[PDB]
Write a protein that binds this ligand. Structure first.
Ligand SMILES: [Mg+2]
Ligand SMILES: [Mg+2]
Ligand SMILES: [Mg+2]
Ligand SMILES: [Mg+2]
Ligand SMILES: [Mg+2]
Ligand SMILES: [Mg+2]
Ligand SMILES: [Mg+2]
Ligand SMILES: [Mg+2]
Ligand SMILES: [Mg+2]
Ligand SMILES: [Mg+2]
Ligand SMILES: [Mg+2]
Ligand SMILES: [Mg+2]
Ligand SMILES: [Mg+2]
Ligand SMILES: [Mg+2]
Ligand SMILES: [Mg+2]
Ligand SMILES: [Mg+2]
Ligand SMILES: [Mg+2]
Ligand SMILES: [Mg+2]
Ligand SMILES: [Mg+2]
Ligand SMILES: [Mg+2]
Ligand SMILES: [Mg+2]
Ligand SMILES: [Mg+2]
Ligand SMILES: [Mg+2]
Ligand SMILES: [Mg+2]
Ligand SMILES: [Mg+2]
Ligand SMILES: [Mg+2]
Ligand SMILES: [Zn+2]
Ligand SMILES: [Zn+2]
Lengths: 127, 214, 25, 81, 100
RNA sequence: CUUGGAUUUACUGAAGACUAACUACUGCGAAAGCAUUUACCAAGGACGUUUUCAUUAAUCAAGAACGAAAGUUAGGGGAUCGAAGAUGAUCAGAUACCGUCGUAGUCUUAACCAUAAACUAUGCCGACUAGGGAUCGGUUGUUGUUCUGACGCAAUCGGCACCUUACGAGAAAUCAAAGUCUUUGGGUUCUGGGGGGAGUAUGGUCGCAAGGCUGAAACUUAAAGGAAUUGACGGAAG
C-alpha cells in the first residue's frame, strides 16, 4: 500500500529540523530546517518557518515516492529542556495537511538516567 | 547537480515468520556499482517497527521491535530479531507516584547462543478495598520479587531458542509467569519485559535464518 | 560593607602583617 | 475527666494497656501444653518461645520462633495452662 | 523573624537533600524545596488532532500523551506565576488550589 | 563550527562522571551525610521475652574519634560543568550580570586541613500537663476484601512529623514545649552581660600553607538591636 519514511522532527528552542529518512534512518531523503526559510536568526524556530520547512519536506517526499511517514518528535533533551520547541507542532500539522499520510507518532527526546553537570553554575543564569 | 535519487534502488523488508505481517516496508540504497555492491552495504541494517504493525492487533501499540537484515535475496531483505523496547510514553504512563517500582535485568544466552540482556519491570498493585493512599512494598519484598524475576528470565531464555523466545515475548508469557510467581510476595501490576538487547550474535547460519523466512 | 568581604579584607591585612614582620623575623 | 477511679480502672481499658503500663505490671504471655499429632505427651512450651522446642518422645519440632508468639507446627495443638 | 515553620522547604528528620536544577535557569535547588509540577499534555494540539486523524493510516489510532515533571526554583516559580505571594494566614493552606 | 560536509540521521565503540522518573511534610545515621543490582564483612535502633547481671548510671573541665564544600601535598584520571584567564554583547565605564571557550578544581588513592546560616539559629538525661487524625518499624487481636501474602478493622510500644486549643508561656512573632518560672529549687555541661575597636594586636599552641584554637587594651560612642503597628514606596501579585 503506502510507502513509509520516518519524519524525525527535532524541535529545539533555537531552530527546527524536519528530517525524513527511510525506516532504518541510514538514508536521508529530505532535511529542511527553519533557518533555511527566514533570514533572521530570531525566528529560525518560528512555527511559520517550521510550516514552510515541512511543506518543502512533503514536496520532496512526494517526488521520491514516500507517501506516508512515522513521526519521531524530539526536544534537545540531555541536560537541556525536555519540552519540544514551538516548531515541532507546526511541522507536524503541516506534514499532516500536505497530503502525506501519518503513521505512528512518538517522542524520542533523549532523557538521562541520572546525568552530567548542566551548564549555568550553582546559582543558575541570573537575569 | 546530480539528483542522487535517480540512482536509488528500492528493496523490500521481510520479517521472520514469528510475526504475522512480514511485509515490513520499503528501503532504498545507492544502486549497485562496480566499486560498491548493494548487498554488502545493505545487510546489517536495523529497522525499528511497531509490533502493532507487525501483528495487526492494536494491543501491541506500545512495543516496538528491531529487525536486523543479514541476508539479501534480490529485492527482498531477510531480517532477524534485533531487540525489544517499550515506547517512552508507555513507560512514562506506567511510572506513577504513591507506588513502588521494581526493576531487574539479567545477561543470559539462548539455546542458539544469542546473548541478551533482558529487563523486567513491575509496579505495586493497589487492592480494591485499600484505603491508605500509597501502595509501597518493603525493600525485602522488592528483593524477593527481583530475584524471582531474574531466575525466571534466566530459565525462560536459556531453555529456548531465539525464535521460540520471540514467540514467547509477543504474548507476554514471561510477564504473566513473573506475575503469577510473585503473587505470594506482593500483588503486582503491569509486569512487563520492557527491553531485550542483543550483545553478541553467534556465527551466521543462513539455513537457520532462511527457516525463519518461509 | 558585607561581613564576608569585611572578613576577607581583614584576612588579607593580617596576611600582609605576617609577611611584613617576617622580613625582620 | 477530673474525677476518676484510678485504683479501680475499667478492666476493658485495663486490658488494652501495655504490659508495663498497668497498675501492677503483668506479662501477657503464658505456658502451653502441646499435643503433637503423633502421640500424647505433655510438653510445657512458653507461648513466646525463642527456641525450636522438640518434645522428648519424638524428635519433632513443636514450634518455630517468630518475632512474637511462637508458631506451632501443623498437627500440633496447644492448651493454655 | 521566622516566616515559615517549615523554613520554606520540606526537610524534617533529615540532614541533607541532593539538589535539582531549575528548569528555567539551571539553579541548584534542594529537591524538597523545589516547586515540582507534573504536566500531562496532549502531544498534538486540539486544533490539529482532526487533520492528523484524517491523515492517519490507522483506524482508531490513539494520540500519545506528553508526560513531564517540571522542577522550578523559588525565583523561577514566582516569576512565572506558578506560585504567587499569599497573605500571612493564607500561606499555611497547603491543599492544592481548587481550580480543576 | 561550516560544500575540506558543519548541524541532523541510523548502527557501533571508548572514556570518565552521575544514579532521573519511582521520590513523599517517607526511611537510616552521632553529626557531616546516605538512593542502580548482587555477594561478602562487621555494626545498629525499635519491637517481642515469666532470659541474665544487679546500680554497673546522668552530665561532663583535661583528653580523644568523626567532621559538607572549598583549599594544600603527591600519584592516577581528566566526560561534563567550570574559580582564574581568553573572548562577544550591554553600558558613560564594566576586565559584572548574558553568550562561547576554558586552567586549577570537580572523580579516585595515600596523607593534611577542622571550618559552614555545620540551623530546629532551640544542649543532654528524667518526670508530669490536651484533644485529633495520619504515617514508618515491631508485636498482639480480628473482615460483605483480592490472591499464603496483600489489604481492611482494632489495640499498643518506639520514631519522623502534622492539625486544633491555649490550661500555660512569651515583648511579640509564636511555642505541646519556648508549659509545670516572684506561688521563683529534678540532675548536669557550655555560653552571654550596651554598640564599636575586634575575633583585631600581643603571647602561646596546632598546621606544609591557607589558616584553626586561645585572645586583650587604648580609644570611641547614646544608642545599636528584637518583635509588632500605621503609613509611604517597590523595575512584586491581584
Ligand atoms: Mg530577576
Ligand atoms: Mg510492610
Ligand atoms: Mg524578611
Ligand atoms: Mg546542613
Ligand atoms: Mg535509579
Ligand atoms: Mg523507604
Ligand atoms: Mg544522636
Ligand atoms: Mg563538668
Ligand atoms: Mg573539651
Ligand atoms: Mg593531582
Ligand atoms: Mg566590556
Ligand atoms: Mg567549559
Ligand atoms: Mg585534590
Ligand atoms: Mg575542612
Ligand atoms: Mg562555628
Ligand atoms: Mg536549616
Ligand atoms: Mg551558634
Ligand atoms: Mg551537650
Ligand atoms: Mg523532658
Ligand atoms: Mg519533673
Ligand atoms: Mg503499624
Ligand atoms: Mg506487647
Ligand atoms: Mg502549634
Ligand atoms: Mg515543634
Ligand atoms: Mg559589650
Ligand atoms: Mg523589623
Ligand atoms: Zn511428639
Ligand atoms: Zn534563582
Amino acid at each position: 500500500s503506502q510507502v513509509f519514511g520516518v519524519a524525525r522532527i527535532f524541535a529545539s528552542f533555537n531552530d527546527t529540523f524536519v528530517h525524513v529518512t527511510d525506516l532504518s534512518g541510514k538514508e536521508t531523503i529530505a532535511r529542511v530546517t527553519g533557518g533555511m526559510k527566514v533570514k533572521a536568526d530570531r525566528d529560525e524556530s518560528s512555527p511559520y518557518a517550521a510550516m514552510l520547512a515541512a511543506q518543502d519536506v512533503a514536496a520532496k517526499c512526494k517526488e521520491v515516492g514516500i507517501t506516508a511517514v512515522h513521526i519521531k518528535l524530539r526536544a534537545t533533551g540531555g541536560t537541556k529542556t525536555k519540552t519540544p520547541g514551538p516548531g515541532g507542532q507546526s511541522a507536524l500539522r503541516a506534514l499532516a495537511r500536505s497530503g502525506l499520510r501519518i503513521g505512528r507518532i512518538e517522542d524520542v527526546t533523549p532523557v538521562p538516567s541520572x546525568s552530567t553537570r548542566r551548564k549555568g553554575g550553582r546559582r543558575g543564569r541570573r537575569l | 547537480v546530480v539528483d542522487p535519487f535517480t540512482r536509488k534502488d528500492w528493496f523490500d523488508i521481510k520479517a521472520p515468520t514469528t510475526f504475522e505481517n512480514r511485509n515490513v516496508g520499503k528501503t532504498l540504497i545507492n544502486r549497485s556499482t562496480g566499486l560498491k555492491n548493494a548487498a554488502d552495504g545493505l545487510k546489517g541494517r536495523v529497522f525499528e517497527v511497531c509490533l502493532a504493525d507487525l501483528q495487526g492487533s492494536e494491543d501491541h501499540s506500545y512495543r516496538k521491535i528491531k529487525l536486523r537484515v543479514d541476508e539479501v535475496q534480490g529485492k527482498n531483505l531477510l531480517t532477524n530479531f534485533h531487540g525489544l523496547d517499550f515506547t517512552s510514553d508507555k513507560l512514562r504512563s506506567l511510572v506513577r507516584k504513591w507506588q513502588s517500582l521494581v526493576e531487574a535485568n539479567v545477561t543470559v544466552k539462548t539455546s542458539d547462543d544469542y546473548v541478551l540482556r533482558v529487563f523486567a519491570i513491575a509496579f505495586t498493585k493497589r487492592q480494591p478495598n485499600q484505603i491508605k493512599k500509597t501502595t509501597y512494598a518493603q525493600s525485602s519484598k522488592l528483593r524477593e520479587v527481583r530475584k524471582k524475576m531474574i531466575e525466571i528470565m534466566q530459565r525462560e531464555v536459556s531453555n529456548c531458542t531465539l525464535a521460540q523466545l520471540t514467540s514467547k515475548l509477543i504474548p507476554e508469557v514471561i510477564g504473566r509467569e513473573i506475575e503469577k510467581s510473585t503473587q505470594t510476595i506482593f500483588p503486582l501490576q503491569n509486569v512487563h519485559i520492557r527491553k531485550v538487547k542483543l550483545l553478541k550474535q553467534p556465527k551466521f547460519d543462513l539455513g537457520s535464518l532462511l527457516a525463519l523466512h518461509g | 560593607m558585607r561581613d564576608k568581604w569585611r572578613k576577607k579584607r581583614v584576612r588579607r591585612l593580617k596576611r600582609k602583617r605576617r609577611k611584613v614582620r617576617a622580613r625582620s623575623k | 475527666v477530673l474525677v476518676q477511679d484510678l485504683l479501680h480502672p475499667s478492666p476493658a481499658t485495663e486490658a488494652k494497656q501495655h504490659k508495663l503500663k498497668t497498675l501492677v505490671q503483668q506479662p501477657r504471655s503464658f505456658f502451653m501444653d502441646v499435643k503433637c499429632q503423633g502421640c500424647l505427651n505433655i510438653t510445657t512450651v512458653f507461648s513466646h518461645a525463642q527456641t525450636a522446642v522438640t518434645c522428648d518422645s519424638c524428635s519433632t519440632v513443636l514450634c518455630t520462633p517468630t518475632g512474637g508468639k511462637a508458631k506451632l507446627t501443623e498437627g500440633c495443638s496447644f492448651r493454655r495452662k | 523573624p521566622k516566616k515559615r515553620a517549615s523554613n520554606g522547604r520540606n526537610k524534617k528528620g533529615r540532614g541533607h537533600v541532593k539538589p535539582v536544577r531549575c528548569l528555567n535557569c539551571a539553579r541548584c535547588v534542594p529537591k524538597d524545596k523545589a516547586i515540582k509540577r507534573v504536566t500531562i499534555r496532549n502531544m498534538v494540539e486540539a486544533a490539529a488532532v482532526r487533520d492528523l486523524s484524517e491523515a492517519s493510516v490507522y483506524a482508531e489510532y490513539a494520540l500519545p500523551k506528553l508526560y513531564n515533571k517540571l522542577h522550578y526554583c523559588v525565583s523561577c516559580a514566582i516569576h512565572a506565576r506558578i506560585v504567587r505571594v499569599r497573605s500571612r494566614t493564607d500561606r499555611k493552606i497547603r491543599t492544592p488550589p481548587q481550580r480543576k
